Design a protein around this ligand. Sequence first.
Ligand code: EFM
Length: 133
Amino acid sequence: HHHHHLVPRGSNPPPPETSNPNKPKRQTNQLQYLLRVVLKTLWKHQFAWPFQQPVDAVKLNLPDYYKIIKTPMDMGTIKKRLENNYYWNAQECIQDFNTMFTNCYIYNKPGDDIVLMAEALEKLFLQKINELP
Ligand SMILES: COc1cc2c(cc1NS(=O)(=O)c1cc(Br)ccc1OC)OC(C)(C)C(=O)N2
């Protein structure tokens, strides 16, 4: 038999939503700070790049990534959610950051370069969180 299962291929899943008209939303002091200070300082950091977009498991040759990580999250998605006023409160946005960091610590090994990057970003995140209004 000449079917060698070379197709169909893998793919990335659809990315998290960044819009949802029926989701409850608010603008709050805390959410404005989350965009203007928290997200924008992490985004500009030289360790941000692995976290600036949904994980492209196809490009990165990480075929196990979406087998292990079932609640993906990234700063591109968070940025867009903040820009779109998607959240109801600060907790929803903070939880997204916490999911992103937790995913990184699940997927990778302590001491890995990616983990060193997440640790540094998480330290900065926690510092900025402490000055939330
Ligand atoms: C092993 O390659 C990677 C592992 C991760 C990763 C990216 C890669 N591949 S890579 O080419 O971006 C890469 C980044 C660093 Br830092 C070190 C080695 C890498 O690939 C070998 O980012 C995410 C998906 C957020 C992750 O949690 N882990």
